Every structure is written in C-alpha cells, then in structure tokens.
Amino acid sequence: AQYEDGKQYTTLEKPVAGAPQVLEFFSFFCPHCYQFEEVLHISDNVKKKLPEGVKMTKYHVNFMGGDLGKDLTQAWAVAMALGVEDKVTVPLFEGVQKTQTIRSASDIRDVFINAGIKGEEYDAAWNSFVVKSLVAQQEKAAADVQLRGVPAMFVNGKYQLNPQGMDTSNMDVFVQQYADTVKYLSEK
C-alpha cells in the first residue's frame, strides 16, 4: 500500500475504547514538541485537514522535567479550563527551553499573569477540582496507551503516528505528510 502499519503509523496491540478522536501528547521540556509547536505548527496543520465533526485534544505529560513537569501538567489543566491554550503555549515553551526562566510554579504563574490572566482567576482555577479532574484526564489518557515518549498522536484510540517513517528533507513536506496520514487514519 502507500500507508502501511509500521510505516507512517503503528497499530496499538491493545486498542483504547472511547478515546478522543484525535489525541496529541506533549511536554514543555520535550525538544521535538517545541519544534512541533512553533516551527512546524503540527496541531494546526492537522486541523486544517481534518473532517466535519472531528475534535482535537492536547494533553501535557508528567514524566519529563520531574517536579516542574507535574506543575506544568496542572498549569496546562488551568490553560484548558480557562480556555487560554493559545495564549500560553508559546511563552511556556520559550520559558522552559529558550530563556530558562521557568524554574518554579511561580515562574509558570508569571507567564499566565503576563499573558493577561488575572491572579485571583489563575489561583482559583489552579486550586479548583475541575482542574483536578482535568489533570486526572490528562494522566488517564496517557496511561491508557502506556505512553513513554512525546510528541505523540493517537487517532481514534486505535493508531499512533510514526513520524520517523516520514522524511525530513523539507519540513513543509513533513507536515503535509504527517497531517495527511492523520486524515487517512481518521477515515479508517
């Protein structure tokens, strides 16, 4: 074929029922995630190719960056609840990996503060149980695919994008190839 298992994707031996249709995993410590985010714009180019009715979920993971890593997953929960993903993603990435100015939960908070979220509003959300469950979800979803590496994308809980079977000569062609694969798996 042109798309075969073990090539542009892999199949999960243990398929995850009722999973979000298009599901992405990342870490703000994850170097490829960084390049996935602000040089490749993967999530975004995948949206521009997905069908009618399809929903995209993005979750942080804990297993990079240790104690900060966890704070970052809770902080992403806050991002999701407050609907500010688009306003923190870049300064969070740049704060961990470019400038190294994020070293404590407090530095994470600053990003949100400087991005315009209100202190009391952030703290409230941070400490809220809607956020607790959102952290819980982020973790359960990862556990359900026994996830060990990021970036990762899962389609319909059944398939896993395998970027290392696509070519990296031209980045724009990588994106196109990646996104098209998602569209393929989506229709499967």
mmCIF file with all atom_site columns, C-alpha atoms in Angstrom:
data_model
loop_
_atom_site.group_PDB
_atom_site.id
_atom_site.type_symbol
_atom_site.label_atom_id
_atom_site.label_alt_id
_atom_site.label_comp_id
_atom_site.label_asym_id
_atom_site.label_entity_id
_atom_site.label_seq_id
_atom_site.pdbx_PDB_ins_code
_atom_site.Cartn_x
_atom_site.Cartn_y
_atom_site.Cartn_z
_atom_site.occupancy
_atom_site.B_iso_or_equiv
_atom_site.pdbx_formal_charge
_atom_site.auth_seq_id
_atom_site.auth_comp_id
_atom_site.auth_asym_id
_atom_site.auth_atom_id
_atom_site.pdbx_PDB_model_num
ATOM 1   C CA . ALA A 1 1   ? 0.000   0.000  0.000  1.00 0.00 ? 1   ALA A CA 1
ATOM 2   C CA . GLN A 1 2   ? 1.007   3.663  0.368  1.00 0.00 ? 2   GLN A CA 1
ATOM 3   C CA . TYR A 1 3   ? 0.093   3.778  4.034  1.00 0.00 ? 3   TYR A CA 1
ATOM 4   C CA . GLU A 1 4   ? 1.056   0.644  5.914  1.00 0.00 ? 4   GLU A CA 1
ATOM 5   C CA . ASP A 1 5   ? 1.254   -0.358 9.566  1.00 0.00 ? 5   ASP A CA 1
ATOM 6   C CA . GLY A 1 6   ? 4.804   0.041  10.859 1.00 0.00 ? 6   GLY A CA 1
ATOM 7   C CA . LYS A 1 7   ? 5.419   2.783  8.270  1.00 0.00 ? 7   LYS A CA 1
ATOM 8   C CA . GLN A 1 8   ? 3.649   6.134  8.765  1.00 0.00 ? 8   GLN A CA 1
ATOM 9   C CA . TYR A 1 9   ? 1.889   4.802  11.829 1.00 0.00 ? 9   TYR A CA 1
ATOM 10  C CA . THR A 1 10  ? 1.675   1.861  14.209 1.00 0.00 ? 10  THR A CA 1
ATOM 11  C CA . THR A 1 11  ? -1.333  -0.048 15.488 1.00 0.00 ? 11  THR A CA 1
ATOM 12  C CA . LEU A 1 12  ? -1.916  -0.473 19.210 1.00 0.00 ? 12  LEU A CA 1
ATOM 13  C CA . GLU A 1 13  ? -1.961  -4.130 20.201 1.00 0.00 ? 13  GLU A CA 1
ATOM 14  C CA . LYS A 1 14  ? -4.353  -3.088 22.954 1.00 0.00 ? 14  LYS A CA 1
ATOM 15  C CA . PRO A 1 15  ? -6.837  -0.625 21.416 1.00 0.00 ? 15  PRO A CA 1
ATOM 16  C CA . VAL A 1 16  ? -8.238  2.115  23.625 1.00 0.00 ? 16  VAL A CA 1
ATOM 17  C CA . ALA A 1 17  ? -12.037 2.220  23.604 1.00 0.00 ? 17  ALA A CA 1
ATOM 18  C CA . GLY A 1 18  ? -13.947 5.507  23.609 1.00 0.00 ? 18  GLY A CA 1
ATOM 19  C CA . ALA A 1 19  ? -10.769 7.581  23.224 1.00 0.00 ? 19  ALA A CA 1
ATOM 20  C CA . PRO A 1 20  ? -10.852 11.195 21.922 1.00 0.00 ? 20  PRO A CA 1
ATOM 21  C CA . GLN A 1 21  ? -10.904 11.090 18.117 1.00 0.00 ? 21  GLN A CA 1
ATOM 22  C CA . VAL A 1 22  ? -7.600  12.942 17.528 1.00 0.00 ? 22  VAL A CA 1
ATOM 23  C CA . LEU A 1 23  ? -5.380  12.953 20.626 1.00 0.00 ? 23  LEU A CA 1
ATOM 24  C CA . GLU A 1 24  ? -1.952  14.609 20.996 1.00 0.00 ? 24  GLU A CA 1
ATOM 25  C CA . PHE A 1 25  ? 0.689   14.406 23.775 1.00 0.00 ? 25  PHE A CA 1
ATOM 26  C CA . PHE A 1 26  ? 3.488   16.831 24.520 1.00 0.00 ? 26  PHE A CA 1
ATOM 27  C CA . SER A 1 27  ? 5.845   18.184 27.147 1.00 0.00 ? 27  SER A CA 1
ATOM 28  C CA . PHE A 1 28  ? 7.197   21.675 27.521 1.00 0.00 ? 28  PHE A CA 1
ATOM 29  C CA . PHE A 1 29  ? 10.577  20.018 28.214 1.00 0.00 ? 29  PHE A CA 1
ATOM 30  C CA . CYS A 1 30  ? 10.276  17.953 25.053 1.00 0.00 ? 30  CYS A CA 1
ATOM 31  C CA . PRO A 1 31  ? 12.575  19.465 22.381 1.00 0.00 ? 31  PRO A CA 1
ATOM 32  C CA . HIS A 1 32  ? 10.739  17.906 19.434 1.00 0.00 ? 32  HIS A CA 1
ATOM 33  C CA . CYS A 1 33  ? 7.432   19.143 20.882 1.00 0.00 ? 33  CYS A CA 1
ATOM 34  C CA . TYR A 1 34  ? 8.876   22.623 20.783 1.00 0.00 ? 34  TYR A CA 1
ATOM 35  C CA . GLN A 1 35  ? 9.803   22.296 17.160 1.00 0.00 ? 35  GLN A CA 1
ATOM 36  C CA . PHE A 1 36  ? 6.438   20.535 16.643 1.00 0.00 ? 36  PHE A CA 1
ATOM 37  C CA . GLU A 1 37  ? 4.800   23.587 18.108 1.00 0.00 ? 37  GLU A CA 1
ATOM 38  C CA . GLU A 1 38  ? 6.344   26.761 16.867 1.00 0.00 ? 38  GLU A CA 1
ATOM 39  C CA . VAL A 1 39  ? 8.349   25.760 13.799 1.00 0.00 ? 39  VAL A CA 1
ATOM 40  C CA . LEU A 1 40  ? 6.106   23.047 12.324 1.00 0.00 ? 40  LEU A CA 1
ATOM 41  C CA . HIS A 1 41  ? 2.662   24.054 13.687 1.00 0.00 ? 41  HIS A CA 1
ATOM 42  C CA . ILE A 1 42  ? 1.532   20.401 13.523 1.00 0.00 ? 42  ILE A CA 1
ATOM 43  C CA . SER A 1 43  ? -1.694  20.620 15.541 1.00 0.00 ? 43  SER A CA 1
ATOM 44  C CA . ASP A 1 44  ? -2.698  23.487 13.398 1.00 0.00 ? 44  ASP A CA 1
ATOM 45  C CA . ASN A 1 45  ? -1.942  21.958 10.031 1.00 0.00 ? 45  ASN A CA 1
ATOM 46  C CA . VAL A 1 46  ? -3.643  18.733 11.122 1.00 0.00 ? 46  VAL A CA 1
ATOM 47  C CA . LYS A 1 47  ? -6.825  20.759 11.940 1.00 0.00 ? 47  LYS A CA 1
ATOM 48  C CA . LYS A 1 48  ? -6.825  22.269 8.500  1.00 0.00 ? 48  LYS A CA 1
ATOM 49  C CA . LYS A 1 49  ? -7.133  18.772 7.079  1.00 0.00 ? 49  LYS A CA 1
ATOM 50  C CA . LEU A 1 50  ? -9.498  17.044 9.444  1.00 0.00 ? 50  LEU A CA 1
ATOM 51  C CA . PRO A 1 51  ? -13.194 16.223 8.560  1.00 0.00 ? 51  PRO A CA 1
ATOM 52  C CA . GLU A 1 52  ? -16.502 17.532 9.743  1.00 0.00 ? 52  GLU A CA 1
ATOM 53  C CA . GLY A 1 53  ? -17.259 16.738 13.377 1.00 0.00 ? 53  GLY A CA 1
ATOM 54  C CA . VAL A 1 54  ? -13.701 15.889 14.463 1.00 0.00 ? 54  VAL A CA 1
ATOM 55  C CA . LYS A 1 55  ? -12.331 17.031 17.808 1.00 0.00 ? 55  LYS A CA 1
ATOM 56  C CA . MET A 1 56  ? -8.703  17.571 18.700 1.00 0.00 ? 56  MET A CA 1
ATOM 57  C CA . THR A 1 57  ? -7.398  17.000 22.225 1.00 0.00 ? 57  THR A CA 1
ATOM 58  C CA . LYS A 1 58  ? -3.910  18.043 23.501 1.00 0.00 ? 58  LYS A CA 1
ATOM 59  C CA . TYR A 1 59  ? -2.511  16.825 26.864 1.00 0.00 ? 59  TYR A CA 1
ATOM 60  C CA . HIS A 1 60  ? 0.674   17.540 28.861 1.00 0.00 ? 60  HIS A CA 1
ATOM 61  C CA . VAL A 1 61  ? 2.671   14.677 30.392 1.00 0.00 ? 61  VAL A CA 1
ATOM 62  C CA . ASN A 1 62  ? 4.447   14.242 33.752 1.00 0.00 ? 62  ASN A CA 1
ATOM 63  C CA . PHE A 1 63  ? 7.479   12.119 33.022 1.00 0.00 ? 63  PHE A CA 1
ATOM 64  C CA . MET A 1 64  ? 9.767   14.891 31.821 1.00 0.00 ? 64  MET A CA 1
ATOM 65  C CA . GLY A 1 65  ? 11.083  17.684 33.980 1.00 0.00 ? 65  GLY A CA 1
ATOM 66  C CA . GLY A 1 66  ? 10.265  15.903 37.226 1.00 0.00 ? 66  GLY A CA 1
ATOM 67  C CA . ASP A 1 67  ? 8.581   18.186 39.789 1.00 0.00 ? 67  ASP A CA 1
ATOM 68  C CA . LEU A 1 68  ? 8.268   21.063 37.348 1.00 0.00 ? 68  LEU A CA 1
ATOM 69  C CA . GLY A 1 69  ? 6.888   18.606 34.818 1.00 0.00 ? 69  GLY A CA 1
ATOM 70  C CA . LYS A 1 70  ? 3.955   17.944 37.109 1.00 0.00 ? 70  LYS A CA 1
ATOM 71  C CA . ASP A 1 71  ? 3.355   21.662 37.828 1.00 0.00 ? 71  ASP A CA 1
ATOM 72  C CA . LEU A 1 72  ? 3.282   22.090 34.043 1.00 0.00 ? 72  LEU A CA 1
ATOM 73  C CA . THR A 1 73  ? 0.546   19.420 33.673 1.00 0.00 ? 73  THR A CA 1
ATOM 74  C CA . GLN A 1 74  ? -1.613  21.141 36.317 1.00 0.00 ? 74  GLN A CA 1
ATOM 75  C CA . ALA A 1 75  ? -0.838  24.520 34.658 1.00 0.00 ? 75  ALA A CA 1
ATOM 76  C CA . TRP A 1 76  ? -1.997  23.074 31.329 1.00 0.00 ? 76  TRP A CA 1
ATOM 77  C CA . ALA A 1 77  ? -5.187  21.904 33.041 1.00 0.00 ? 77  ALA A CA 1
ATOM 78  C CA . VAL A 1 78  ? -5.649  25.590 34.015 1.00 0.00 ? 78  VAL A CA 1
ATOM 79  C CA . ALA A 1 79  ? -4.968  26.554 30.406 1.00 0.00 ? 79  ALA A CA 1
ATOM 80  C CA . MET A 1 80  ? -7.679  24.212 29.215 1.00 0.00 ? 80  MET A CA 1
ATOM 81  C CA . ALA A 1 81  ? -10.349 25.153 31.773 1.00 0.00 ? 81  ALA A CA 1
ATOM 82  C CA . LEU A 1 82  ? -9.678  28.888 31.277 1.00 0.00 ? 82  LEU A CA 1
ATOM 83  C CA . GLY A 1 83  ? -9.510  28.411 27.541 1.00 0.00 ? 83  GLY A CA 1
ATOM 84  C CA . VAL A 1 84  ? -6.139  30.133 27.260 1.00 0.00 ? 84  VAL A CA 1
ATOM 85  C CA . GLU A 1 85  ? -4.106  27.412 25.458 1.00 0.00 ? 85  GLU A CA 1
ATOM 86  C CA . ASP A 1 86  ? -3.375  29.670 22.551 1.00 0.00 ? 86  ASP A CA 1
ATOM 87  C CA . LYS A 1 87  ? -2.084  32.438 24.831 1.00 0.00 ? 87  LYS A CA 1
ATOM 88  C CA . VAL A 1 88  ? 0.363   30.475 26.976 1.00 0.00 ? 88  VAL A CA 1
ATOM 89  C CA . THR A 1 89  ? 1.678   27.750 24.706 1.00 0.00 ? 89  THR A CA 1
ATOM 90  C CA . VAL A 1 90  ? 4.467   29.770 23.133 1.00 0.00 ? 90  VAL A CA 1
ATOM 91  C CA . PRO A 1 91  ? 5.705   31.601 26.295 1.00 0.00 ? 91  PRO A CA 1
ATOM 92  C CA . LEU A 1 92  ? 5.607   28.338 28.226 1.00 0.00 ? 92  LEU A CA 1
ATOM 93  C CA . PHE A 1 93  ? 7.747   26.598 25.592 1.00 0.00 ? 93  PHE A CA 1
ATOM 94  C CA . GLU A 1 94  ? 10.127  29.551 25.328 1.00 0.00 ? 94  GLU A CA 1
ATOM 95  C CA . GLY A 1 95  ? 10.294  29.826 29.128 1.00 0.00 ? 95  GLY A CA 1
ATOM 96  C CA . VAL A 1 96  ? 11.427  26.221 29.703 1.00 0.00 ? 96  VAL A CA 1
ATOM 97  C CA . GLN A 1 97  ? 13.646  25.690 26.646 1.00 0.00 ? 97  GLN A CA 1
ATOM 98  C CA . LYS A 1 98  ? 14.827  29.044 25.245 1.00 0.00 ? 98  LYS A CA 1
ATOM 99  C CA . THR A 1 99  ? 15.237  31.555 28.078 1.00 0.00 ? 99  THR A CA 1
ATOM 100 C CA . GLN A 1 100 ? 15.216  29.067 31.045 1.00 0.00 ? 100 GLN A CA 1
ATOM 101 C CA . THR A 1 101 ? 13.195  31.429 33.137 1.00 0.00 ? 101 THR A CA 1
ATOM 102 C CA . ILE A 1 102 ? 10.705  28.833 34.273 1.00 0.00 ? 102 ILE A CA 1
ATOM 103 C CA . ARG A 1 103 ? 12.142  27.103 37.326 1.00 0.00 ? 103 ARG A CA 1
ATOM 104 C CA . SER A 1 104 ? 9.250   27.134 39.790 1.00 0.00 ? 104 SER A CA 1
ATOM 105 C CA . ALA A 1 105 ? 5.476   27.025 39.800 1.00 0.00 ? 105 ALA A CA 1
ATOM 106 C CA . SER A 1 106 ? 5.738   30.740 40.384 1.00 0.00 ? 106 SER A CA 1
ATOM 107 C CA . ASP A 1 107 ? 7.567   31.339 37.113 1.00 0.00 ? 107 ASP A CA 1
ATOM 108 C CA . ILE A 1 108 ? 4.785   29.366 35.397 1.00 0.00 ? 108 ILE A CA 1
ATOM 109 C CA . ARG A 1 109 ? 2.254   31.663 37.060 1.00 0.00 ? 109 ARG A CA 1
ATOM 110 C CA . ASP A 1 110 ? 4.051   34.723 35.683 1.00 0.00 ? 110 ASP A CA 1
ATOM 111 C CA . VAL A 1 111 ? 3.557   33.577 32.139 1.00 0.00 ? 111 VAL A CA 1
ATOM 112 C CA . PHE A 1 112 ? -0.138  33.476 32.748 1.00 0.00 ? 112 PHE A CA 1
ATOM 113 C CA . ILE A 1 113 ? -0.044  36.810 34.554 1.00 0.00 ? 113 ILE A CA 1
ATOM 114 C CA . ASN A 1 114 ? 1.908   38.470 31.795 1.00 0.00 ? 114 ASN A CA 1
ATOM 115 C CA . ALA A 1 115 ? -0.390  36.855 29.250 1.00 0.00 ? 115 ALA A CA 1
ATOM 116 C CA . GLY A 1 116 ? -3.269  38.697 30.878 1.00 0.00 ? 116 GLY A CA 1
ATOM 117 C CA . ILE A 1 117 ? -4.970  36.072 33.033 1.00 0.00 ? 117 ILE A CA 1
ATOM 118 C CA . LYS A 1 118 ? -5.869  37.563 36.412 1.00 0.00 ? 118 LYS A CA 1
ATOM 119 C CA . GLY A 1 119 ? -4.020  36.425 39.540 1.00 0.00 ? 119 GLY A CA 1
ATOM 120 C CA . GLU A 1 120 ? -7.109  35.520 41.538 1.00 0.00 ? 120 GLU A CA 1
ATOM 121 C CA . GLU A 1 121 ? -8.538  33.830 38.438 1.00 0.00 ? 121 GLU A CA 1
ATOM 122 C CA . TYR A 1 122 ? -5.419  31.713 37.866 1.00 0.00 ? 122 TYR A CA 1
ATOM 123 C CA . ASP A 1 123 ? -5.018  30.769 41.553 1.00 0.00 ? 123 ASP A CA 1
ATOM 124 C CA . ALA A 1 124 ? -8.707  29.906 41.786 1.00 0.00 ? 124 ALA A CA 1
ATOM 125 C CA . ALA A 1 125 ? -8.547  27.635 38.737 1.00 0.00 ? 125 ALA A CA 1
ATOM 126 C CA . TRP A 1 126 ? -5.192  26.205 39.884 1.00 0.00 ? 126 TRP A CA 1
ATOM 127 C CA . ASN A 1 127 ? -6.746  25.120 43.099 1.00 0.00 ? 127 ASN A CA 1
ATOM 128 C CA . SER A 1 128 ? -10.126 24.064 41.683 1.00 0.00 ? 128 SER A CA 1
ATOM 129 C CA . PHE A 1 129 ? -11.274 20.443 41.420 1.00 0.00 ? 129 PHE A CA 1
ATOM 130 C CA . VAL A 1 130 ? -12.453 21.000 37.843 1.00 0.00 ? 130 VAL A CA 1
ATOM 131 C CA . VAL A 1 131 ? -8.774  21.317 37.248 1.00 0.00 ? 131 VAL A CA 1
ATOM 132 C CA . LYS A 1 132 ? -8.009  18.277 39.418 1.00 0.00 ? 132 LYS A CA 1
ATOM 133 C CA . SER A 1 133 ? -10.184 16.142 37.171 1.00 0.00 ? 133 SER A CA 1
ATOM 134 C CA . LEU A 1 134 ? -8.552  17.730 34.125 1.00 0.00 ? 134 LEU A CA 1
ATOM 135 C CA . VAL A 1 135 ? -5.147  16.679 35.400 1.00 0.00 ? 135 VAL A CA 1
ATOM 136 C CA . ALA A 1 136 ? -6.687  13.260 36.092 1.00 0.00 ? 136 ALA A CA 1
ATOM 137 C CA . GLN A 1 137 ? -7.906  13.011 32.493 1.00 0.00 ? 137 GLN A CA 1
ATOM 138 C CA . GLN A 1 138 ? -4.519  14.056 31.142 1.00 0.00 ? 138 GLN A CA 1
ATOM 139 C CA . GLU A 1 139 ? -2.978  11.290 33.098 1.00 0.00 ? 139 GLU A CA 1
ATOM 140 C CA . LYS A 1 140 ? -5.529  8.574  32.440 1.00 0.00 ? 140 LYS A CA 1
ATOM 141 C CA . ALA A 1 141 ? -5.400  9.094  28.668 1.00 0.00 ? 141 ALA A CA 1
ATOM 142 C CA . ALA A 1 142 ? -1.608  8.715  28.755 1.00 0.00 ? 142 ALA A CA 1
ATOM 143 C CA . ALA A 1 143 ? -1.760  5.623  30.945 1.00 0.00 ? 143 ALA A CA 1
ATOM 144 C CA . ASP A 1 144 ? -4.292  4.098  28.578 1.00 0.00 ? 144 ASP A CA 1
ATOM 145 C CA . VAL A 1 145 ? -1.679  3.906  25.793 1.00 0.00 ? 145 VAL A CA 1
ATOM 146 C CA . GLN A 1 146 ? 1.256   3.163  28.118 1.00 0.00 ? 146 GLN A CA 1
ATOM 147 C CA . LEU A 1 147 ? 2.976   6.301  26.890 1.00 0.00 ? 147 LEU A CA 1
ATOM 148 C CA . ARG A 1 148 ? 6.798   6.592  27.217 1.00 0.00 ? 148 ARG A CA 1
ATOM 149 C CA . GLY A 1 149 ? 7.701   9.237  24.698 1.00 0.00 ? 149 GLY A CA 1
ATOM 150 C CA . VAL A 1 150 ? 6.470   12.552 23.297 1.00 0.00 ? 150 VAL A CA 1
ATOM 151 C CA . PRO A 1 151 ? 5.428   14.067 20.920 1.00 0.00 ? 151 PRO A CA 1
ATOM 152 C CA . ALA A 1 152 ? 2.768   11.520 20.267 1.00 0.00 ? 152 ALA A CA 1
ATOM 153 C CA . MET A 1 153 ? -0.543  11.478 18.409 1.00 0.00 ? 153 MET A CA 1
ATOM 154 C CA . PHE A 1 154 ? -3.221  8.839  18.632 1.00 0.00 ? 154 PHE A CA 1
ATOM 155 C CA . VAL A 1 155 ? -6.127  8.511  16.202 1.00 0.00 ? 155 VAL A CA 1
ATOM 156 C CA . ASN A 1 156 ? -9.464  7.122  17.442 1.00 0.00 ? 156 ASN A CA 1
ATOM 157 C CA . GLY A 1 157 ? -7.584  5.376  20.225 1.00 0.00 ? 157 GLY A CA 1
ATOM 158 C CA . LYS A 1 158 ? -6.528  2.867  17.597 1.00 0.00 ? 158 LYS A CA 1
ATOM 159 C CA . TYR A 1 159 ? -3.414  4.216  15.833 1.00 0.00 ? 159 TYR A CA 1
ATOM 160 C CA . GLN A 1 160 ? -0.185  6.030  16.597 1.00 0.00 ? 160 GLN A CA 1
ATOM 161 C CA . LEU A 1 161 ? 1.570   8.485  14.276 1.00 0.00 ? 161 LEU A CA 1
ATOM 162 C CA . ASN A 1 162 ? 5.041   7.340  13.389 1.00 0.00 ? 162 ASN A CA 1
ATOM 163 C CA . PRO A 1 163 ? 6.965   10.413 12.207 1.00 0.00 ? 163 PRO A CA 1
ATOM 164 C CA . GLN A 1 164 ? 10.171  8.510  11.949 1.00 0.00 ? 164 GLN A CA 1
ATOM 165 C CA . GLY A 1 165 ? 8.784   6.733  8.802  1.00 0.00 ? 165 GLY A CA 1
ATOM 166 C CA . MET A 1 166 ? 8.297   10.102 7.032  1.00 0.00 ? 166 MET A CA 1
ATOM 167 C CA . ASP A 1 167 ? 11.098  12.238 5.554  1.00 0.00 ? 167 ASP A CA 1
ATOM 168 C CA . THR A 1 168 ? 12.596  15.369 6.975  1.00 0.00 ? 168 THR A CA 1
ATOM 169 C CA . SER A 1 169 ? 14.343  16.855 3.920  1.00 0.00 ? 169 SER A CA 1
ATOM 170 C CA . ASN A 1 170 ? 11.691  19.527 3.659  1.00 0.00 ? 170 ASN A CA 1
ATOM 171 C CA . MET A 1 171 ? 9.749   20.451 6.817  1.00 0.00 ? 171 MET A CA 1
ATOM 172 C CA . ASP A 1 172 ? 6.669   21.621 4.941  1.00 0.00 ? 172 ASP A CA 1
ATOM 173 C CA . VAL A 1 173 ? 6.545   18.254 3.211  1.00 0.00 ? 173 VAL A CA 1
ATOM 174 C CA . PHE A 1 174 ? 6.902   16.551 6.598  1.00 0.00 ? 174 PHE A CA 1
ATOM 175 C CA . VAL A 1 175 ? 3.857   18.430 7.908  1.00 0.00 ? 175 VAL A CA 1
ATOM 176 C CA . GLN A 1 176 ? 1.840   17.655 4.784  1.00 0.00 ? 176 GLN A CA 1
ATOM 177 C CA . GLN A 1 177 ? 2.769   14.007 5.049  1.00 0.00 ? 177 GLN A CA 1
ATOM 178 C CA . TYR A 1 178 ? 2.082   13.899 8.794  1.00 0.00 ? 178 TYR A CA 1
ATOM 179 C CA . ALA A 1 179 ? -1.271  15.649 8.562  1.00 0.00 ? 179 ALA A CA 1
ATOM 180 C CA . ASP A 1 180 ? -2.396  13.606 5.568  1.00 0.00 ? 180 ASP A CA 1
ATOM 181 C CA . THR A 1 181 ? -1.603  10.460 7.495  1.00 0.00 ? 181 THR A CA 1
ATOM 182 C CA . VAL A 1 182 ? -3.860  11.716 10.303 1.00 0.00 ? 182 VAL A CA 1
ATOM 183 C CA . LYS A 1 183 ? -6.588  12.357 7.773  1.00 0.00 ? 183 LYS A CA 1
ATOM 184 C CA . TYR A 1 184 ? -6.074  8.778  6.487  1.00 0.00 ? 184 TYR A CA 1
ATOM 185 C CA . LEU A 1 185 ? -6.214  7.213  9.938  1.00 0.00 ? 185 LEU A CA 1
ATOM 186 C CA . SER A 1 186 ? -9.205  9.408  10.734 1.00 0.00 ? 186 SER A CA 1
ATOM 187 C CA . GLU A 1 187 ? -11.216 7.960  7.826  1.00 0.00 ? 187 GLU A CA 1
ATOM 188 C CA . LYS A 1 188 ? -10.248 4.380  8.647  1.00 0.00 ? 188 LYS A CA 1
#
